[PDB]
Amino acid sequence: SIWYQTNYVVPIGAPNTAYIIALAAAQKNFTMKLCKDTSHILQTASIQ
Amino acid sequence: ETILEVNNVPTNATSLMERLRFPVSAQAGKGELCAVFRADPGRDGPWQSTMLGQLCGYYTQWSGSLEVTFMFTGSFMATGKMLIAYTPPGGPLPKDR
Amino acid sequence: SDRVAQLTIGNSTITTQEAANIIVGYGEWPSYCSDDDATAVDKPTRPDVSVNRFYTLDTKLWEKSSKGWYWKFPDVLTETGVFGQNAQFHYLYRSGFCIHVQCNASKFHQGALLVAILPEYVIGTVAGGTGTEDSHPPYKQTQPGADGFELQHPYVLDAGIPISQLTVCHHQRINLRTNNCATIIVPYMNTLPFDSALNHCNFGLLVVPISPLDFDQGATPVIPITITLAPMCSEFAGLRQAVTQ
Amino acid sequence: SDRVAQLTIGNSTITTQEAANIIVGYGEWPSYCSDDDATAVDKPTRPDVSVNRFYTLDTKLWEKSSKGWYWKFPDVLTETGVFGQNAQFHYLYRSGFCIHVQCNASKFHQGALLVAILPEYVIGTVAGGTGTEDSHPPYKQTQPGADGFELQHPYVLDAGIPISQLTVCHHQRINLRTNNCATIIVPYMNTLPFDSALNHCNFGLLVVPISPLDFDQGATPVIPITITLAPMCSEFAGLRQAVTQ
Amino acid sequence: GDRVADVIESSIGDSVSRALTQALPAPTGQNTQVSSHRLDTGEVPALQAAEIGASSNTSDESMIETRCVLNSHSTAETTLDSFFSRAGLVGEIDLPLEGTTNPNGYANWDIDITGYAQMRRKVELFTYMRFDAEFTFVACTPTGQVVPQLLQYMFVPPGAPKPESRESLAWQTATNPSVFVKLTDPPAQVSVPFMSPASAYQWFYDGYPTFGEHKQEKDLEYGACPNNMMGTFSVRTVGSSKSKYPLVVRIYMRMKHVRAWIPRPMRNQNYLFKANPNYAGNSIKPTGTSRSAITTL
Amino acid sequence: GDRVADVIESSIGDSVSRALTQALPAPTGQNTQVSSHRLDTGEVPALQAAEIGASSNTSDESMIETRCVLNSHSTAETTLDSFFSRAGLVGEIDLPLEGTTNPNGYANWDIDITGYAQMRRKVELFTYMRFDAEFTFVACTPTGQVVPQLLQYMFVPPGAPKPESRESLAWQTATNPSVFVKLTDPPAQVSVPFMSPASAYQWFYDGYPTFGEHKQEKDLEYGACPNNMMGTFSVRTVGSSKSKYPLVVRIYMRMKHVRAWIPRPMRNQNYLFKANPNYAGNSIKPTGTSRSAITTL
Amino acid sequence: EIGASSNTSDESMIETRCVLNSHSTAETTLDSFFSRAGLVGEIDLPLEG
């Protein structure tokens, strides 16, 4: 969760609404196992 | 690092580019809430559109530490502070900072 | 190499890029009581990383006509977390602190703040205005809780002592021209090795705006002040049932 | 040299003069998890003497027509003391135990008890009597709390397993002819190094009267059974807010 | 470093398991020594205390007058590998032609070895197990006849989308392990490793897997351990149109490299449900058999 | 011993006070070195940051062109023993003949040095003090006259029964230290040690000494530190019948072997009560004095 | 804005414990990801069509 600690302070002339971009990654102790088929995709029938 | 679709509110095709960033603005100064998302990289959510959400869709189990790198794209003369809290499971959505 | 800093203790982390320096209270780091200073005969418990972490208390509103606020320590941490649940069960208590006050503004705002640590800050009242009645401050003003209390006469600090000599104790200044945070590390200051954590408040934090706030019409009008503090080298001794006050 | 014993751990002490022996569960003492077995990356907190102490749970009434009781561990210690306040805030949990059951009588009373430790004692119901409905036990029967729960059919232990083979696990017998207390030291038995302390109950204590009570008219008619237990080498990991269940 | 004396002389952080026992090699049974008559005082090897909890340590020589016997009975039969490496029936999958059970030529079977009572009673002797497997799939008609039919076995790990029908696009097995057999050959046999996130399986898990207010709707999740839900087994008749031979698949699992922890009593009552230790409430049957009196046989 | 690695390489139990400062001997003031003109870049000794909190470290040589001065001004006057070892009036006890204040020839005085404003402002510069004392009792008539009268001073420790009257049986001083003086001699002078249960006195104690629900009746116990309630001082005219000379006793305390901790601001307002930092609400007087404008004097 | 990713260790953000990690990374290699036979084509041979 992302909470406003103090506020977003802005002077005269600069715009009101800003934006934050979130970028996710993995560490050097990441490990995966038990290879499977992908879940979060489908496919329509009758290709071509 | 790859872009995490935290603001997965819009649906239509003319505004699908808005699902990469989430807005901040001026509040009443009560310690408000900006955004929340789960930290599961194998669930239908924000982690689905990363390189970690498609390469851990081809695996059943995973281990190790995740990390979420943010980036501010505002003005130079505008400052602010944010609290980015991580809740271990069991604890529901908090009602206050 | 000096403007930016990071405070990592426990499972919390404060990162700031407009910091001045980390002051150390009286040149002494917080530590555990030695065998010479110790009085009790039971082994003191010491949770390592479950109490030595930052607790973001509350958000204030620095308006134009502000006067000041004060928080009595460690009264503010008797309802928050494992520290607030250990000080209700235990009798003896010993900890340093690490106080960090954030207050941000743009490069078009001006103003200053005085962040002070006053040991045994005894609140005195106005004695009925004229000075005839032997009045005493109530319980909701002496130990205010985690919400602080607004100062009524900040020139005499509501205690009879003037504000202009407050900087003989620990002080850092939040001047909205150069910095935006004030970090103070306070050791354990008491005549006894341990102390009760429900009646005796060791020191009082004072945040008073010396130079006022000012801005022109068009900037955002509310400027918040947030206190963030972490106990350090906490110790507890003597178990009993849970009593609130 | 063997009949009398004393258990000193924390700030509590149990002294008994009619004890048999202190059994050790599976020949393994409780300990802390090594770096090979550890999975988490945060430093685990460990209160030394504030949780490793005896908690006297509740007094039962061993009447003539008693059947048995069972307590699920560590469900009984989520509302008592600093241990009951650390398991509500933390996520991971790891501890051994040390269970001591007192039951006294004179030299004119007769009877026996079976004090058993059954790991992952899964409660099963009667499936509607005939065995047609897929019923399930409620929440007030699965995790009963600190008050236990009376067994309805003690021959099958309310789980389908017979009582006559219960002594393959840890067992001591409170026979009111020779001894009056049964002390068991249980290590940490789980497939994982840490575990949640709010849903998973590790083992269940079973106190069932095998040989019944008997006395003549003139002795005092009520014989109480009290459970007293102390965690040992407790550890916690992962902070969050206080959630009850 | 350290300067206090209640930490440098403390025992906080003892990680090694201080064991009181030490496993000794015992390839055969124990012999018997020669014992003579003994009529002494104080030294009694027949009187114990069952209130202690430990068992009897009475040797045979300290109770009767024995003879020297060089015992050479091997104990290599009662080990764990020589007790569990016998393949038993753990599941049966039906594929009929005209019916309501599986009328679309496919059937999905969840992986659990607690469906048949003869294998279930052996593995529930222990609480934690850790084994490999050798599955075996013997397919035949309900009348036992072998027909020339091609079949596809598919192991669906937990998470992957199950096939909705026979012509679905999940059968293309790009990463799922699949076995293609006919019926006119020896039956298929694979080797499944220890596939659990935990360090051992567990057949008895006391507690809930979720958080929150457990009321009358969410009571069926009690005892469902998610360290054992290993996925879904799926079969189909490999083709497009309707087949014409009915099929029955039988699954036989044998365990190898078995390690077991924490024994427990074995069940004596009838089983009623899968992964649910319910029993009959009115029909509580005793373990042994009854006689007329105790004074006679 | 220890086998885990997060304890053997930890820092839990650091008992020594890791000090950043180190007290150096300084018998006189610091000299001044010769400095020349300096017109360099980057090296600025006049620009600081008051936001850091530390004070100015600007030497006099780095701001002007100085001369070499061998300074020999001794700093032996500003020490703690040369500041507090001056006896000031801390209490006054009245003994009249016909009145309502003390008409029975005795008066009980509680021990506190916060009764007179001139001694109180010096000792409240610090928070914790640790001192011995040298009390001095100068007795005289209200007109200053010295009469031939015998007097008994009695130090009553906290707990002992106070005398109800002049002929009471607590005046027999079997273990209480008492001083018997006349008035025609030099005044009495004793030496009181550090008599506190704590390690230092404290004139400001923020908090309550009791537990429980602090409501409007029990509000007067705030700030009453029981590590400072040292007992009761008692005087009487040594005799049975009524005396005929009025008496006034004055008490003068000087501190020796003084150690002080944690300085604090000194009070600028008027005092109003004993052991109670109240002030006038309407009459808030500024510290300095006022002028007409800031541009002129 | 540099383009490189995060090099933040876990020890420089929280208070960690010593863990001797022994999780093998022999599953995520290229040979253990692609050596699984999948259907790449289907050829039909009917009688009357």
Ligand SMILES: CCCCCCCCCCCCC/C=C/[C@H](O)[C@H](N)CO
């Ligand atoms: C073509 C692949 C063949 C299918 C292979 C399946 C592998 C699954 C491993 C089998 C090991 C037994 C699983 C045990 C779990 C028990 O059912 C649960 N604890 C109780 O429901």
Ligand SMILES: CCCCCCCCCCCCC/C=C/[C@H](O)[C@H](N)CO
């Ligand atoms: C014949 C005996 C003479 C009486 C000697 C009295 C000894 C008491 C020691 C005096 C030291 C000063 C006590 C200071 C306490 C302050 O009044 C309180 N902190 C504030 O009320």
